[PDB]
Design a binder for this molecule. Structure first.
Ligand SMILES: [Zn+2]
Lengths: 51, 64
């Protein structure tokens, strides 16, 4: 029950949970481009010149 | 609030074309054909009936 002292420890192993692999996909997923505005189909002159 | 009796620019009676425009849009016309088929040919007359927020069906809910 004396509990004598011991020598100096050489190395200290650190145990830790691993990096989060297979979380990010190898291609990227962007928000798609909002489309450029279209001229709508079915546009015709509705105004006739009077008389 | 309610549809004006006359168009502002030229004085055409457009004030009788609100119920018979809701009736054409409820019967599946496009707004580019529910204004020509009411006889609104100038774009000041079409403007009054295309861009109109009839804000009295929302204001009569608060009624005694
Ligand atoms: Zn007008």
């Amino acid at each position: 029950g004396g509990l004598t002292c011991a020598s100096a420890p050489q190395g200290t192993l650190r145990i830790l949970e691993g990096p989060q692999q297979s979380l990010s996909g190898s291609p990227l997923q962007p928000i798609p481009a909002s489309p450029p505005p279209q001229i709508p189909p079915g546009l015709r002159p509705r105004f006739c010149a009077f008389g | 609030m309610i549809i004006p009796v006359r168009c502002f620019t030229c004085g055409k009676i457009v004030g009788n074309k609100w119920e018979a425009y809701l009736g054409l849009l409820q019967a599946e016309y496009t707004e580019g054909d529910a204004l020509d088929a009411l006889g609104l040919k100038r774009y000041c007359c079409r403007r009054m009936l295309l861009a109109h927020v009839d804000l009295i069906e929302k204001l009569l809910n608060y009624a005694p």
